Amino acid sequence: GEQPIFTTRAHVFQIDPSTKKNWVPASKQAVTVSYFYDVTRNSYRIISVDGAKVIINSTITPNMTFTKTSQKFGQWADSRANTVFGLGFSSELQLTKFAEKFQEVREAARLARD
């Protein structure tokens, strides 16, 4: 009931809630990050898992934005989890492809709820 849409690998970070200025690593090494379409819920999600620890389970809505802050790093806010996720990539192209997929998914999310 869940189809993978796009898969990449990145280092995952979350912004420190107190200072809002520091990145806390949410994974020791790089982890798999995937976009999924949830056929049961008619929604798109970003899912990253490190064994039995679910690091990212972000449902993507049209309002959410992925902001690139370097050639290899970008971030998006997830109000449901009350956090900001950052992803660090080993090549600039992986960041670009992730950002482009993110924008694609935002419109799919809005078109899917029409």
Binding site: H11, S70, G86, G88
Partner: peptide, 19 residues
């Protein structure tokens, strides 16, 4: 709020060079 008045710097490993 989760809003940023200023965007945060990326982690030092993933920053763009400056110079």
């Amino acid at each position: 709020l989760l809003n940023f008045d200023e965007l945060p710097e990326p982690p030092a490993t993933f920053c763009d060079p400056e110079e």
